[PDB]
């Protein structure tokens, strides 16, 4: 990949009227001392006392591959499930034409890493020109916020170096 | 339903698990909203589960169907158990191994 165009795939202020978009921050991802979160994913949680099943599609009208990142979240105790997504038996499901995997929150005890007994799996996929990707969830989805339309090069690559540019 | 391989050769078995778009289709098709399909050989051994979802329509179908295969070895038995969503094997293939054959892509005429 030699270039891409970042675009706001589901804008935070307008895509999620029925879900809370302002509370998904964490000391683990902090910024300037306070809790914050990735800039390209939005962590939806429950609005008031209820987290209705969301479904949201994006169609790829970009005429390029679009890389879509997202996440499924796995909190440590069923109490956290409830306080976060209010649905103890929730699920997240993601379907492209190609990609197509239903996930499921697995509430467990993990050692604390960056002070977090919860874990979050990050996922990606290449949605092809024309294809549509649909997300359905009753909790635990870390929605895509910004995604990337890709320009293929060749003979580029990744290297590891401490030499100065 | 089990099949035992009395062929003295490998038998390739194909089958499918079906995933319809809405719970209404589950009901009309297999009547068991919480169904499952499970397939066990001695070697192969994977329980599957119907995942009802919204997919774009491909060949006019919001449902999808995964195709599966396996080599059941001489003597082995393969058992299918299901409460819906199984696309059963109908015909299967007993295999004769060669070597130095292969698959090629060509538009030259035979």
């Amino acid at each position, epitope marked *: 990949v030699s270039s891409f165009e970042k675009f706001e795939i*589901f*804008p935070k*202020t*307008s*895509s999620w*009227p*029925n879900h*809370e978009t302002t509370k998904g921050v964490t000391a683990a991802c902090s910024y300037a001392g306070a809790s914050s979160f990735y800039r390209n994913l939005l962590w939806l949680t*429950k*609005k*008031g*006392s*209820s*987290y*209705p*099943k969301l*479904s*949201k*599609s*994006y*169609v790829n*009208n970009k005429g390029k591959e679009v890389l879509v990142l997202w996440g499924v979240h796995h909190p440590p105790t069923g109490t956290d499930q409830q306080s976060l997504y*209010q*649905n103890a038996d*929730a699920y997240v499901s993601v379907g492209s034409s190609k990609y197509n995997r239903r996930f499921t929150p697995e509430i467990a005890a993990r050692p604390k890493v960056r002070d977090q007994a919860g874990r979050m799996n990050y996922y990606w996929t290449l949605l092809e020109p024309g294809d*549509t990707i649909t997300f359905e969830a*009753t909790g635990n989805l870390i929605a895509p916020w910004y995604a990337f339309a890709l320009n293929r090069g060749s003979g580029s690559g990744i290297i590891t170096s401490d030499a100065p540019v | 339903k089990s099949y035992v391989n009395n062929k003295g050769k490998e038998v390739l078995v194909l089958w499918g698990v079906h995933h319809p778009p*809405t719970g*209404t289709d589950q009901q009309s098709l297999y009547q068991n909203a919480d169904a499952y399909v499970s397939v066990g050989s001695s070697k192969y051994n994977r329980r599957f589960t119907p995942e009802i979802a*919204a997919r*774009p*329509k491909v060949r006019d179908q*919001a449902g999808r169907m995964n195709y599966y295969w396996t080599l059941l070895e001489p003597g082995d038995t393969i058992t299918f158990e299901a409460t819906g969503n199984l696309i059963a094997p109908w015909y299967a293939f007993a295999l004769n191994r060669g070597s130095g054959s292969g698959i090629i892509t060509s538009d030259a005429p035979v």
Partner: antibody
Framework: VQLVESGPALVKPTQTLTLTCSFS??????????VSWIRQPPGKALEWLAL??????????TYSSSLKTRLTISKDTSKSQVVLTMTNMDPVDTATYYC????????????????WGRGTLVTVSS | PVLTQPPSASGTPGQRVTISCSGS????????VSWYQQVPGTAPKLLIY???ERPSGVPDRFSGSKSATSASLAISGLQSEDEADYYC????????????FGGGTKLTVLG
């Protein structure tokens, strides 16, 4: 769970209409909801106007630019009513105004325009 | 930003009718569609939500679909009380986001 819309039945052109929506009935329910205002001219299609969320404070107003700058929507949780105010009324605004609910019950899809008040006629005339 | 329906459609008792609703990528192309049935000049009733969950006490002859950027209402075994106006609706993610209703279609049972 009931909704009465209420407001002037008559308004002079250029005046501001305040319609209030009152909620009646208790709930031991684990659900929130937003309220929308939607209006319908006589013989015409429904037109969505605004919406306000019950547990949230977030709100939306039709992008419709003939009327994005005239609408205001507010809640008073203590009086359990939602107030629409619309400034600079024209005869063209004469219509039946409705307030309606969106029910959010957890894990189902959204109770989209759940439950409608009966609606009030509002005629703009001199 | 509008949702297009046919001005009207008709059928004979017994048949299926399908009223079609066409939007754009930021609304139907992204969100679930709801269908409303209206008796002339009374309050509308919710028929479909979540793309076809019928709210409690809607007959199962009412069904809906969404594919691409259009949706479609399906009323099977057409009966008398069915004659009314039908609206489709969707949330739209453009601008600061808003709700949109379709123009509505007029439905008459014939014969």
């Amino acid at each position: 769970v009931q909704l009465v819309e209420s407001g002037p039945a008559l308004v002079k052109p250029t005046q501001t209409l305040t319609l209030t929506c009152s909620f009646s009935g208790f709930s031991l329910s684990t659900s929130g909801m937003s309220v929308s205002w939607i209006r319908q001219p006589p013989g015409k299609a429904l037109e969505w106007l605004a919406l306000i969320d019950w547990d949230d404070d977030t709100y939306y107003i039709t992008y419709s630019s003939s009327l994005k700058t005239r609408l205001t929507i507010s809640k008073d949780t203590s009086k359990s009513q939602v107030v629409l105010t619309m400034t600079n009324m024209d005869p063209v605004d004469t219509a039946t105004y409705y307030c309606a609910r969106t029910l959010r019950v957890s894990g189902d899809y959204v109770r989209d325009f759940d439950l409608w008040g009966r609606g009030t006629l509002v005629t703009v005339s001199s | 930003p509008v949702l297009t329906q046919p001005p009207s459609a008709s059928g004979t008792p017994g048949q299926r009718v399908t009223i079609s609703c066409s939007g754009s990528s930021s609304n139907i192309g992204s969100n679930t569609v709801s269908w409303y049935q209206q008796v002339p000049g009374t309050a509308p009733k919710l028929l479909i939500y979540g793309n076809n969950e019928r709210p409690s006490g809607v007959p199962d002859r009412f069904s809906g679909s969404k594919s691409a950027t259009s949706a479609s209402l399906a009323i099977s075994g057409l009966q008398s009380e069915d004659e009314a106006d039908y609206y489709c609706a969707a949330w739209d993610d453009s601008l600061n986001g808003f709700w949109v209703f379709g123009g509505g279609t007029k439905l008459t049972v014939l014969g």
